[PDB]
Amino acid sequence: LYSNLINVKQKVISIREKLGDPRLKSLVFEYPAGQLFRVTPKLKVSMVPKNMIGLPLDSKSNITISADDYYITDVSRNVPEAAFRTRAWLDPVINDSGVIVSGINCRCHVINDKSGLSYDLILRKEREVRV
């Protein structure tokens, strides 16, 4: 069916969090304009190693940076597609208010959507991060 398949995939994946593994990271998005959208499972993510590159703002400049990216493997399709056009945060903290203080700032760099029941995406860290 592909409709209940994504939801059952979320239910079966929710077993992974009951086992304490350190690869699990909390991902949040800001899909609506002002407030946040959180992925339900505390999914796992790997880190592709860094590469030393020029600035993406101006490539032919003295300022250079290291591009750091994260590889998120099992992320449900139930999340809105337009969420991927908005900045994402890995391990964020929410206060008493609706804002976030600390976390690791990332932007969706490349989408892999070959599997029909889950997305898989790589997201690049911002050049300036909070923590």
Binding site: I63, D68, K125
Partner: protein
């Protein structure tokens, strides 16, 4: 004179009152911020680059023929690289790092090295500055904070084009002590060509000729008579 004494004076002028150099070596520092007077300061290093563009032109107006030994004017480019590492733990954003103070420190070193003509070596004839490059590249592999973000590295080069006087007499086997033995053997069984040695005048002999009546000729031996042979110091008689 010799470049090792000159380079020692150049690094001394560099660290004299401008740049504080914690260590000297080709490596970005992984030491923590250095605590002095209860104040934290970023780690730094200096790389003294090998002297390049060593050229001897013998074609300048500031070379005097003193008549003892031939002088030369040597041009060299002396390159120093100073690197400061700013940890991302304290410096969260790029724009809050103190790039302005680094540029001020760099311009102060440039002014101090340029002004100190009489303080680096007496035989300096020119000191000029190439355009300095300031880079805010990341550190080699130094990470500070969570997510392993690379630390800020501020790299500033100083390339001094410097023209100075030299002579053959300034170089002795003492300054080559750990690289070359004195009085070595030739690689193909050849003889070494000995340079000229300063000649000392320890006697003078004059033989004058009394020429014939019309004029001096000085070619044919019958047109002049030997008068006397004069030894200017009397002690040269019976000696040589």
């Amino acid at each position: 004179m010799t470049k090792p004494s000159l380079i020692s004076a150049k690094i001394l002028q560099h660290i004299n009152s401008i740049v504080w150099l914690q260590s000297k070596g080709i490596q970005e520092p992984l030491k923590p911020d250095v605590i002095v007077n209860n104040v934290a300061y970023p780690p730094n290093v200096i790389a003294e680059k090998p002297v390049t563009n060593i050229e001897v032109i013998t074609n300048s107006s500031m070379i005097e023929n003193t008549g003892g030994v031939r002088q030369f004017l040597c041009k060299a480019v002396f390159e120093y690289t100073i690197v400061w590492v700013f940890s991302r733990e304290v410096y969260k954003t790029y724009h809050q790092i103190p790039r302005s103070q680094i540029q001020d420190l760099l311009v102060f070193c440039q002014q101090f090295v340029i002004s100190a003509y009489q303080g680096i070596d007496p035989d300096i004839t020119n000191i000029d500055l190439k355009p300095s490059q300031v880079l805010v590249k990341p550190t080699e592999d130094v990470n500070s904070d969570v997510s392993n973000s690379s630390s800020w590295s501020v790299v500033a080069d100083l390339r001094f084009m410097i023209e100075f006087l030299t002579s053959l007499d300034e170089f002795l086997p003492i300054d080559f002590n750990k690289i070359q033995p004195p009085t070595w053997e030739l690689l193909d069984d050849l003889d070494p060509i000995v340079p000229e040695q300063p000649f000392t005048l320890n006697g003078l002999i004059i033989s004058l000729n009394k020429s014939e009546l019309p004029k001096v000729r000085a070619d044919e031996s019958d047109t002049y008579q030997l008068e006397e042979i004069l030894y200017i110091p009397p002690t040269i008689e019976d000696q040589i």
